[PDB]
C-alpha cells in the first residue's frame, strides 16, 4: 500500500512510520514545508502509525533527538515515538478490509488528515489547534499537549485495567477533535476501508 505523507505545515516536520517492532519503509524522514514522500506499507501489516515529530536534530549517521515523537534517537524510526504524538493508525489486510484511525491517546503535537487516495471509505481528521488550546496541566514544556495518562500515571487515565471512563481530559481532546480517539475505551471512530486502500496523510491540512 502506498502513503502519501504531505507537510502542508509551515514548519519542517520529520515524519515517522512504524509497527512498533520495525520500522515501515525506511521508518522516517524530513519533510520541509510543503513537500511530499510517498511510503510502502507491506499489506496485512496491523497496529500501523505514522506521525509528525518536531524540533530534531540528527546527525550524519541518523542519530539525534526531536522534541516530540523522538523514536530512541533515530531518524529512521524502527519504534513508537514519544509522546505528545497525534497518531495516524492503520491496520491493512484485516480479513479483506483496512482499517483507519486518528488518535489523541498520546497527546497531541501537529494537527493531521489521514484518508484514503482510493475509493469506497471516508477520511479522519484531528486539526484543531489543540496545542493553543491546551489545558495548563497537559502543556508539555518540550512542545505539544500530552495526554493524562502521560501526565498522571494512573489507572483511570491509562485504563489500565480495561474499565476507565471519559476524563475531564479526554473531553477536551474529543471537544477539539470529535473525530479522534480521545481514551482508550472512546467510542471508536475507525473507518472501514476496502482492502489494499492507499493512503495519505496530510500535517497541518488546514
Known amino acids: ?15 515517522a512510520a512504524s509497527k512498533g517492532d520495525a520500522a515501515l519503509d525506511a521508518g522516517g524522514r524530513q519533510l520541509n514545508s510543503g513537500e511530499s514522500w ?5 499489506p496485512g501489516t496491523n497496529g500501523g502509525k505514522i506521525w509528525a515529530r518536531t524540533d530534531c536534530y540528527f546527525d550524519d549517521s541518523g542519530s539525534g533527538i526531536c522534541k516530540t515523537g523522538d523514536c530512541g534517537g533515530l531518524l529512521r524510526c524502527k519504534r513508537f515515538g514519544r509522546p505528545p504524538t497525534t497518531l495516524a493508525e492503520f491496520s491493512l489486510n484485516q ?5 483507519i484511525d486518528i488518535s489523541n491517546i498520546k497527546g497531541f503535537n501537529v494537527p493531521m488528515n489521514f484518508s ?9 481528521r ?8 491546551c489545558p495548563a496541566k497537559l502543556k508539555a514544556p518540550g512542545g505539544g ?12 487515565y491509562c485504563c489500565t485495567t480495561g474499565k ?26 475507525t473507518v472501514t476501508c476496502p482492502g489494499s486502500s492507499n493512503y495519505r496523510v496530510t500535517f497541518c491540512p488546514t
Do not use: H, M
Not at 480479513?95 to 482499517?99: E, F, H, N, T
Not at 484514503?116 to 479522519?124: A, E, I, K, L, S
Not at 471512563?165 to 480517539?181: H, I, V
Open 164 to 189: 476507565c471512563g471519559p476524563t475531564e481530559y479526554s473531553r477536551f481532546f474529543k471537544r477539539l477533535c470529535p473525530d479522534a480517539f480521545s481514551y482508550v475505551l472512546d467510542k471508536p471512530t
Open 38 to 42: 510517498t511510503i510502502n506499507v507491506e
Open 95 to 99: 480479513y479483506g478490509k483496512d482499517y
Open 145 to 156: 499537549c500530552n495526554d493524562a495518562c502521560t501526565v498522571f500515571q494512573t489507572s483511570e
Open 116 to 124: 484514503p487516495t482510493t475509493r469506497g471509505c471516508r477520511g479522519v
Open 1 to 15: 500500500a502506498t502513503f502519501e505523507i504531505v507537510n502542508r505545515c509551515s514548519y519542517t516536520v520529520w515524519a
Open 126 to 133: 484531528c486539526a484543531a489547534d489543540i496545542v493553543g488550546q
